[PDB]
Design an enzyme around this catalytic site. Structure first.
Site, PDB file in Angstrom:
ATOM      1  N   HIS A   1       0.850  -1.224   0.000  1.00 27.23           N
ATOM      2  CA  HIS A   1       0.000   0.000   0.000  1.00 27.23           C
ATOM      3  C   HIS A   1       0.876   1.262   0.000  1.00 27.23           C
ATOM      4  CE1 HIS A   1      -2.776  -2.996   2.059  1.00 27.23           C
ATOM      5  NE2 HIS A   1      -3.403  -2.631   0.942  1.00 27.23           N
TER       6      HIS A   1
ATOM      7  N   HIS B   1       5.489   7.068   6.660  1.00 29.21           N
ATOM      8  CA  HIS B   1       5.220   6.634   5.283  1.00 29.21           C
ATOM      9  C   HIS B   1       4.688   7.835   4.522  1.00 29.21           C
ATOM     10  CE1 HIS B   1       1.412   6.283   7.378  1.00 29.21           C
ATOM     11  NE2 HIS B   1       0.864   6.664   6.241  1.00 29.21           N
TER      12      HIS B   1
ATOM     13  N   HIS C   1       2.054   9.185   1.035  1.00 26.90           N
ATOM     14  CA  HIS C   1       1.041   9.008   0.034  1.00 26.90           C
ATOM     15  C   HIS C   1       1.435   9.906  -1.119  1.00 26.90           C
ATOM     16  CE1 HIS C   1      -1.589   7.192   3.082  1.00 26.90           C
ATOM     17  NE2 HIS C   1      -0.957   8.009   3.899  1.00 26.90           N
TER      18      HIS C   1
ATOM     19  N   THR D   1      -6.153   6.897   7.700  1.00 21.38           N
ATOM     20  CA  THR D   1      -6.636   7.097   6.349  1.00 21.38           C
ATOM     21  C   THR D   1      -6.595   5.871   5.511  1.00 21.38           C
ATOM     22  OG1 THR D   1      -4.529   7.845   5.438  1.00 21.38           O
ATOM     23  CG2 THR D   1      -5.941   9.539   6.410  1.00 21.38           C
ATOM     24  N   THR D   2      -6.234   4.725   6.124  1.00 20.69           N
ATOM     25  CA  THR D   2      -6.345   3.410   5.486  1.00 20.69           C
ATOM     26  C   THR D   2      -7.187   2.531   6.419  1.00 20.69           C
ATOM     27  OG1 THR D   2      -4.280   2.694   6.554  1.00 20.69           O
ATOM     28  CG2 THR D   2      -4.116   3.468   4.329  1.00 20.69           C
TER      29      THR D   2
HETATM   30 CU   LIG Z   1      -0.660   7.913   5.915  1.00 19.66          CU
END
Ligand SMILES: [Cu+2]
Ligand SMILES: [Cu+2]
Length: 257
Positions: free
Chosen positions: A61, A91, A93, A195-196
């Protein structure tokens, strides 16, 4: 069952995770004409001098740079927060195109990417307990725009070929996350969610006002990652962002006039 593809993207997530349609979902659009300065706030305290990075992992992801969170080594305090929040991972996006990729937006503007530094509240003992609490996590979000290179990102860029596909990991010791911050720590804050999936409503969001710049070459290397595992058909890891969700009965507060 969930991803960012043609048939399993954010618009589908509610079927397995009904909280996707909840009261405190993230990201949101930050309207700079309605977010109100809050004098009750403090300055952020970001204390990353003793951070111990461990590993970088492609999870299918995004990729996570993981930290030792078994002691108070890299912590976030202050701001809207009570207590001490330990850095577990960061991480990103990002988009397929420079005009999209961020999760939060600012007056409906999308950035090229967004960095999430994820921290959990030490009063809950571990991450898995923290995500079950409304004040379990604090996420420092930082926008990325394409322009000059970010020198402190280059070590990440240069390890990406070693973790191209889902499930690969590599040693990633001695990384200093301070090299990912902008100059200013001015921020917006609001209560929200992961947000996941599982989209838990456990996050105090702290979104920095000042973006960082990364180069077009840096972003291009992110776009060579794969969602798929080795020996599977190649699906570029791009557009791994959830769009803005309704603000509902929330206020966004600013740390700055
Ligand atoms: Cu994130
Ligand atoms: Cu699945």
């Amino acid at each position: 069952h969930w991803g960012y593809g043609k048939h399993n993207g954010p618009e589908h997530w509610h079927k397995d995770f009904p909280i996707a349609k909840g009261e405190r979902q993230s990201p949101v659009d930050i309207d700079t004409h309605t977010a109100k300065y809050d004098p009750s706030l403090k300055p952020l305290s970001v204390s990353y001098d003793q951070a111990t990075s461990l590993r970088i992992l492609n999870n299918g992801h995004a990729f996570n740079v993981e930290f030792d969170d078994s002691q108070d080594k890299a912590v976030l305090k202050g701001g809207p927060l009570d207590g001490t929040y330990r850095l577990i991972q960061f991480h990103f996006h990002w988009g397929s195109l420079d005009g999209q990729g961020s999760e939060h937006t600012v007056d409906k503007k999308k950035y090229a990417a967004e960095l999430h530094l994820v921290h959990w509240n030490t009063k809950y003992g571990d991450f898995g307990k923290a995500v079950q609490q409304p004040d379990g996590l604090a996420v420092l979000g930082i926008f990325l725009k394409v322009g000059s290179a970010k020198p402190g990102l280059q070590k990440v860029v240069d390890v990406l070929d070693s973790i191209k596909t889902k499930g690969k990991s590599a040693d990633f010791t001695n990384f200093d996350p301070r090299g990912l911050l902008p100059e200013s720590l001015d921020y917006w804050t609001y209560p929200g969610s992961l947000t996941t999936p599982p989209l838990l409503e456990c996050v105090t969001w702290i979104v920095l006002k000042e973006p960082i710049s990364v180069s077009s070459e840096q972003v291009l290397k992110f776009r060579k990652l794969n969602f798929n595992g080795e020996g599977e058909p190649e699906e570029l890891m791009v557009d791994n962002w959830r769009p803005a969700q309704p603000l509902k009965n929330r206020q966004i507060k600013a740390s700055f006039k």
